Amino acid sequence: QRIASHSHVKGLGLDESGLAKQAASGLVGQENAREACGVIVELIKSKKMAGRAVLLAGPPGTGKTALALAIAQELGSKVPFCPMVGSEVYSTEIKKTEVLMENFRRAIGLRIKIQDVTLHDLDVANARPMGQLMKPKKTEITDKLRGEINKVVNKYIDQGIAELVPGVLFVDEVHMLDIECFTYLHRALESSIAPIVIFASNRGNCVIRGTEDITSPHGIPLDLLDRVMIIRTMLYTPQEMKQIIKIRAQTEGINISEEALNHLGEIGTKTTLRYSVQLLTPANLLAKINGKDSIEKEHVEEISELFYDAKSSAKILADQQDKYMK
Amino acid sequence: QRIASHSHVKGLGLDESGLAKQAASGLVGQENAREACGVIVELIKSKKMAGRAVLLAGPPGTGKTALALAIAQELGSKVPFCPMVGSEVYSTEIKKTEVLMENFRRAIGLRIKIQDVTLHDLDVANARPMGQLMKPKKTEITDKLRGEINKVVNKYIDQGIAELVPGVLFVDEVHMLDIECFTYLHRALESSIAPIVIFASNRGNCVIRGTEDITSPHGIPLDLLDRVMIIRTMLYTPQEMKQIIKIRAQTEGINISEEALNHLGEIGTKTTLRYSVQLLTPANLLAKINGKDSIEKEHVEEISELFYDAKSSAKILADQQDKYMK
Amino acid sequence: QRIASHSHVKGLGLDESGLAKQAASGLVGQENAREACGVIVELIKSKKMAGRAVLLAGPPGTGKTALALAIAQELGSKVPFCPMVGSEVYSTEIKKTEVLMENFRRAIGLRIKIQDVTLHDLDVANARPMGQLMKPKKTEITDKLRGEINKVVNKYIDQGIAELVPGVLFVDEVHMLDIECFTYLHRALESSIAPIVIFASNRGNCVIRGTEDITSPHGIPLDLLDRVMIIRTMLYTPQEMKQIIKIRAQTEGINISEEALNHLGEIGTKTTLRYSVQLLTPANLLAKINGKDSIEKEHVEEISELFYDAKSSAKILADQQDKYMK
Amino acid sequence: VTRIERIGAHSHIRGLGLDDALEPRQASQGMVGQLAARRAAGVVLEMIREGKIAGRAVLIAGQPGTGKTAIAMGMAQALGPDTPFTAIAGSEIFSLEMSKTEALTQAFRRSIGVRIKEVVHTVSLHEIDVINSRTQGFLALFSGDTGEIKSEVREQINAKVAEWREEGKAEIIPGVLFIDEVHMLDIESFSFLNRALESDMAPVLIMATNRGITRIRGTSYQSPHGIPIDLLDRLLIVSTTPYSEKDTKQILRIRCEEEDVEMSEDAYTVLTRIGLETSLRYAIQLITAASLVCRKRKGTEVQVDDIKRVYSLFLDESRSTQYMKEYQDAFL
Amino acid sequence: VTRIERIGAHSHIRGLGLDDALEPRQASQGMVGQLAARRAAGVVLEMIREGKIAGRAVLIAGQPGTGKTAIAMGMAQALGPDTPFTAIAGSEIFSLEMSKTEALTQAFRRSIGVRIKEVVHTVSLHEIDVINSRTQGFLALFSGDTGEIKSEVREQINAKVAEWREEGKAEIIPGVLFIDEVHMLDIESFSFLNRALESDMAPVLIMATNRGITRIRGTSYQSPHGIPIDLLDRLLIVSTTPYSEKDTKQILRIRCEEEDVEMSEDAYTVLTRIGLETSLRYAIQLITAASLVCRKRKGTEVQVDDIKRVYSLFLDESRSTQYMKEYQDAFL
Amino acid sequence: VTRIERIGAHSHIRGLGLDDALEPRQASQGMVGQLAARRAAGVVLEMIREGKIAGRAVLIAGQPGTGKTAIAMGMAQALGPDTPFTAIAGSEIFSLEMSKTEALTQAFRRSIGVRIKEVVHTVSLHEIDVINSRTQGFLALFSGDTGEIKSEVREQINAKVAEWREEGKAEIIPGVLFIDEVHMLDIESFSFLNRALESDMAPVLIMATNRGITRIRGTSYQSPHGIPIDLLDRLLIVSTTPYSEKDTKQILRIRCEEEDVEMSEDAYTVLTRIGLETSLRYAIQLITAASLVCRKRKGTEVQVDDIKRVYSLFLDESRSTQYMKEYQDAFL
Numbered sequence A, B, C: 001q002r003i004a005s006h007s008h009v010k011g012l013g014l015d016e017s018g019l020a021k022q023a024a025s026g027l028v029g030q031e032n033a034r035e036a037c038g039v040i041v042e043l044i045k046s047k048k049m050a051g052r053a054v055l056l057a058g059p060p061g062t063g064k065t066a067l068a069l070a071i072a073q074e075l076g077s078k079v080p081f082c083p084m085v086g087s088e089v090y091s092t093e094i095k096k097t098e099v100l101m102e103n104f105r106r107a108i109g110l111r112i113k114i115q116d117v118t119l120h121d122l123d124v125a126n127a128r129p130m131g132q133l134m135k136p137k138k139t140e141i142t143d144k145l146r147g148e149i150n151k152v153v154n155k156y157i158d159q160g161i162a163e164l165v166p167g168v169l170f171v172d173e174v175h176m177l178d179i180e181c182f183t184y185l186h187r188a189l190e191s192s193i194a195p196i197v198i199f200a201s202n203r204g205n206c207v208i209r210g211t212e213d214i215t216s217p218h219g220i221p222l223d224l225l226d227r228v229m230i231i232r233t234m235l236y237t238p239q240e241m242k243q244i245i246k247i248r249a250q251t252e253g254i255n256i257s258e259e260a261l262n263h264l265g266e267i268g269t270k271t272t273l274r275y276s277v278q279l280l281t282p283a284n285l286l287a288k289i290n291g292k293d294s295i296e297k298e299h300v301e302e303i304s305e306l307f308y309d310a311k312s313s314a315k316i317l318a319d320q321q322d323k324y325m326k
Numbered sequence D, E, F: 001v002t003r004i005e006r007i008g009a010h011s012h013i014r015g016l017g018l019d020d021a022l023e024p025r026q027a028s029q030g031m032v033g034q035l036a037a038r039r040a041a042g043v044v045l046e047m048i049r050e051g052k053i054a055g056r057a058v059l060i061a062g063q064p065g066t067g068k069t070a071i072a073m074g075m076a077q078a079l080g081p082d083t084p085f086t087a088i089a090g091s092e093i094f095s096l097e098m099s100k101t102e103a104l105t106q107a108f109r110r111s112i113g114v115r116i117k118e119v120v121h122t123v124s125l126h127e128i129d130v131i132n133s134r135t136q137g138f139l140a141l142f143s144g145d146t147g148e149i150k151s152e153v154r155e156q157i158n159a160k161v162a163e164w165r166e167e168g169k170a171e172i173i174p175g176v177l178f179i180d181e182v183h184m185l186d187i188e189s190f191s192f193l194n195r196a197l198e199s200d201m202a203p204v205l206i207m208a209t210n211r212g213i214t215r216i217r218g219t220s221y222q223s224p225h226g227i228p229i230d231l232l233d234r235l236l237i238v239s240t241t242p243y244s245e246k247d248t249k250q251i252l253r254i255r256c257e258e259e260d261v262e263m264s265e266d267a268y269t270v271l272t273r274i275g276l277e278t279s280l281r282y283a284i285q286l287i288t289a290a291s292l293v294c295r296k297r298k299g300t301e302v303q304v305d306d307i308k309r310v311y312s313l314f315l316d317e318s319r320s321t322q323y324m325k326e327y328q329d330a331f332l
């Protein structure tokens, strides 16, 4: 299997009391957010509440998506987990509130005795019906059909045929939603049927999209922020960054000497955590060319010369601004 | 049968000479505009004239829609009367000038001997001579088809088989039209086939929709205003407001004491006619719950305490601006 | 049969060594641009290069479209010449880059052993096979299909059945394209398959469409201006203007005296060449009304009195600004 | 067992909690305090059951978290399933398949029931419109994709239903359209509502907004709720007030009872301090979290330490805005 | 009996009122004054009847109410029904089903007739385009719904029609496209019109506008007539002047004749004074109102008193604007 | 004979011109200079051929004419036809058929090959998506009438392809998506790309842009390269430098060899000076122009007089702008 940016993440790495171990299940540090996410895992597993929402807020590269995906590993594959980005609502076929409602219905599961289906699957199955060769266009499924599907699902649950599995919606990049989308989430989050929601945002005091210079904290209006519980993620220390760089090396199947690892951590103190982690695979490939099987400080140094980080490149654009295009 | 806000309006209430009675056919006061509307009624009844427009202008609550509906009642059910709002031109299926053209063609009637059909009915009938998963759609019907329909209608009139009934288009909220719609109305009103048009507007000097910053007198361009006659509606005195409140109490089947009627008169003079008229049914419900068959002053006072007019609510929101959303 | 604005243009009017004659093939003056256009004719006739772009730049009425159509006449009907206007990219059915790609593919010809087709013809033929009655919408043809058509055409050329005829795409009014179209033109022009492209523009240092007041030399981005060679067209002298007016009189079947020709030359110097050329046919009709078959001077002065040029009408509008609408 | 309906934000609301005289009780049917707005909602509720006056419009204005939506669910619970209660967000009218006026027309027509006797069948005016719009149009009631239904279809059904009412075959039950967050509507939508309310077939229009004197969407004019003054003249406004200390505690007691959470008396006092400070919604959100933390330590009653723990773990908006400001230029 | 055509704004216009030498008569065929503009329209009409020169463009400029559309109706009446005369407003090309350039192309090709002998059938190029666009395409000429016709269809139809012309199987009837209020077109539409007029198949374009030096739509640039200077270089501009007292009274007489209204000479003097004071169209609009008041009075001839009565009843723009500004805070 | 492929802008480019140690030769495979950028591109090529790490992002930054697209073409040539290489301009995702995130999803899925053995088939993930989305969806692969494919189909195909991979019925060939001119993407597209690169199925993304500190499209915020900082943190930046005199001369030599053009050494010196004065692409265009002018005079070697002649005939941007500014009144 191919290695992804969150392949190392296996769970929240909490002990039996819910307190976060310093390094467990691929995560390192960030104990307060990991402990808070453990409470949210217990909220989802209880299956009692509906529509409760949380927001992961912090600087970039501080594990907001890793925490959300760590929650998904804790729940398992039985529980539905519907990831999305905020920019997916801008569909050319259906309105934006339909795209949110479709994603919300995807996050409520149903085990029918065996079939694993979502409420969205029952909606689209019953929405569609002889000349059925046109383009499969999505449609704005009405609340009447969704009301009827809810009644049928309750009848099968009372008959003992179906088992409800309330899951999780994960709206990463929630600032990409506009004011119409945010206001629609008030109705969606207040429903007795709705799933648990996890928002993630890295903005601070930016204009809400679709308004006219209405700045709000994060990128979310204060109306929606009143309806959510914010979980804060901190920056990582150099030692925490070094541990994270080490875990990514074992995930990518890369041997790195301690002197190289210290240099990558020093490169990690400048630049970003993401930049130093990205140098591991080019450094390993460069080591394999030299006729070597391990990365050496000089392999990390040469890759740093070849590949520029964001701040280093911005200095070139600032100095050579007349040469570059506007 | 359910009571709307214009249910009491039965006609213009003028006399045989055309002068307006002070109180007749549900209308009260506004005698100059009622006499002008009677002249428009005789213009419509005479046939003989196409594409003549009249604008009802005045502040809110002065009976512009009441006078248009009084004209509709005076003409009767035989004459077509097509109401619309300015915001109905913004169709997803067809362009705005098509929506205007279809409403203009709806306003022209035809009695084919006893079949009551409009030119728009013939247009859509001949444009669609279909199901099996093929939804019907509004389409941009061409001038060619409407030309052939006009020729066939003239042929049927020449044979004595059809009788033309030129009706009325009533475009309320004409300020909601944009500059392209107003420019298309120049061509539409100049036609020899077009009906009598009635516009209504409550706007002062304000920007025409669709233009950058072009201000205009009624929110209408000056070119269209040159093409219309203007009927002014004036504000009502307290005695006229009291008479209107009495007619609305009679129409709603509500008994009301003269002390309560005077109190509603002062409330309407203090706030608005519409607010005082709206207070009648809640006061009657409160009186009925208290075991009374008529409204007394205490019921009106309690209802005024329970329900706020717009200006009092604006005062409360101006006082507490920081605690309300921006 | 009918006389168009460029119907007198028959070629570039160059001698055998490539130098432009003073007056030949309907063109007059403009010798540097005509010689450059002859070099571009040799470039197109060589059939070696792909995707090389040319920009014709100069003030209005200096023969940019005349030079492009002269190049088209020089190539002949065997070579495909696809005229295009920049505002044609704004299609309701397909995206703008698809419209550009379809025109670019239209400009590449193919003679199959004898029928003339273009790559766009094979594209639309192979894109699709109840469908005969269903509305034939344009579609965003993929690069997979175009690559497959390219392989099939290469197989045809290998067998000796087909012969490739690389042609020209003439995008007049290129300033009407927006920044997305201009950016796509980099990829379109840098391809090994694309035809020669001719652009025309008369804009000064102008804002590029689709950008927030990013001003640029020809209304065209510097990125695309780096990719094109620029042919400059000049304003004409009075003698060149008189020669052009005489050629237009000959083409329109109009006899004109030398005194009337001199007066039209003065009028053209005073206002524009295009206005003076437009006065010819009305003066001929006026002479025919007065029982003559040759324009004398008083016919030209009467037509100049009857019809206004742009500057005189602008002067009247500026003088009478309050009376005219805004 | 886990059914499709679970403990939501307004699940404890089981009516308006009024007596026969529409006098609100202090604590009844899940509602707490807010006596003027609940009394006004009772009067509007009796107007809806009367069903004689068409197109009556009411706005529920007030600060956020003052029970505007709680009242509207209170009216919907008290009215029952027989009368229609169409509930929409303001942003739902912005549709790709249909215009804003068409979307508002369908919402108006959905809120008017028709009981038709063959045995009784209940169908709204919107259902009859869609079925007559095309052959097998009843698919479109579930899938959407209705398109813009022609004016001639709705006029014919208006006369047909009026014929059946006079015949006694049909009976019309006018319902409620509740547009929550009505400030999201634009000026074209509000102008359509001015004449839509004047029809005799129109339902009772409840609306809710928390906006001050704000810009109307689609214009550049300030107006007292983001709503134009012409529509506001057609309205009666009901003002919900903010809650006192005792009303906040009583609301938290009912939510604890709804969620089946036991808390000590000191926990009710301290979480209340956190709430009168931050917001009512934040204090409600800490009930289930503190129950889970108390459950993790094998406790049975939520204590003050559980409230302080979840207070530290989960931030309200005011505190989270502060930590972001001390990390200015880290956030994008 | 009432036929579908009734008395419209330009129903009294039957031509341009010119003699054989194109010299305009002072009062002829319903036209009054505008001698230079009518002479220019006569020259353009002879150009259209000649049909040799392709794509020649004309603009009718002038103040509002100066007979620009009246002159265009006079050209349409004088040309007769055999030649095409496509009349459109500038706002009609903003279609939801086709692009602007497609709509302009269809308007161009509607204006070119093709008379095919066999029985004789007159058909426009646009009709042949829509027929050969698809198998059942002829329905789309009535329903609209043509879509964006492929350019290849238009090129092969141009080639086939040219082959018919050379064979003598068909005759080309070049006509007129009239775009009233061309200032509603945007910069893309004008840019398309620059090259569309260069075709040998293009018709004679006539345009009308009352705009001064104002913004071009879709830009932020000022230009005369709201049109770009590049397009204005391709046109010949015809200027219509305002009317004197005598021409105003003559137009009011002709409109009274059209409407079958008899007025005293003092009523004509008062209405001419009103028309000079306010606008020609307002004075024309008062004619049938005064006639209706006279009929309600059981009179036979409109007097000064009826004119003053309808002057008091119906306001022009100036008095209405002044009374609105007096009560300005009441208006929204 | 004349084939479909002719002499393009990058047709001389045959690879990256690196030795087995990924060290660039000074002149090899049509590539000259840019030693650091070519070495970095070789490292990226080895990463692509490895196919272990998913969703890797690389940005090629530098001034215009510095070989960013040349480096991308060299990487595509050295990679070979077997591995997928999807190339798109940034403006191509602005589709009327589908949303921007859908277009980026289809571009991602086209870059992941699936080699299926039975005879050996090879298809992208997008091919399987379009085939399974509809009963005759395979026509939509060629016509592009896919619409927005449902996410259920894509995740089901991911599960099925993973099952085939485990059972040995299929092999995954991760390729490259090359977005040239990525500054044309807007903020929604960049935000989608942030999470698209985090999936294990994503290809190696490569990006090119010549922008400095500039506004991001769809926002008012400035950022380096026109890209937001959050996406820039996820990628490695490769910088291309401007060319020296001898590098420019070698590039002109290789382009003369590609075009079968013979020149004298004095013509080479003059053209190198012209290329340094104005731009590299202008000199490369003047190669073909001077070759044609030399052929016109029955020559066989391009001389300095031919270069001067075509320098006179064809203007670069700076001379054109200066000559325009001398007549700015005439230009519109």
Ligand SMILES: Nc1ncnc2c1ncn2[C@@H]1O[C@H](COP(=O)(O)OP(=O)(O)OP(=O)(O)O)[C@@H](O)[C@H]1O
Residues within 6 Å of the ligand: C005, C006, C009, C026, C027, C028, C029, C030, C059, C060, C061, C062, C063, C064, C065, C066, C067, C172, C173, C200, C201, C202, C244, C273, C274, E194
């Ligand atoms: N050198 C020339 N010799 C002869 N006729 C010419 C010449 N230049 C222009 N004309 C004619 O003058 C008229 C205006 O020229 P043209 O439309 O080509 O100018 P332009 O403004 O450069 O073009 P465009 O706006 O189409 O890009 C046309 O009739 C053209 O045929």
Ligand SMILES: Nc1ncnc2c1ncn2[C@@H]1O[C@H](COP(=O)(O)OP(=O)(O)OP(=O)(O)O)[C@@H](O)[C@H]1O
Residues within 6 Å of the ligand: A186, A223, D009, D010, D013, D030, D031, D032, D033, D034, D062, D063, D064, D065, D066, D067, D068, D069, D070, D071, D209, D210, D251, D280, D281, D284
């Ligand atoms: N009087 C009340 N009795 C009981 N619970 C209440 C009362 N008022 C509000 N609540 C509860 O408090 C929370 C407030 O949310 P609610 O949606 O009612 O507020 P709102 O006034 O509509 O605010 P917004 O302007 O943010 O939409 C909900 O849990 C609601 O059930």
Ligand SMILES: [Mg+2]
Residues within 6 Å of the ligand: C065, C066, E198
């Ligand atoms: Mg030209």
Ligand SMILES: [Mg+2]
Residues within 6 Å of the ligand: A186, D068, D069, D070
């Ligand atoms: Mg609420």
Ligand SMILES: [Mg+2]
Residues within 6 Å of the ligand: E068, E069, E070
């Ligand atoms: Mg006019």
Ligand SMILES: [Mg+2]
Residues within 6 Å of the ligand: F068, F069, F070, F180, F208
């Ligand atoms: Mg490039």
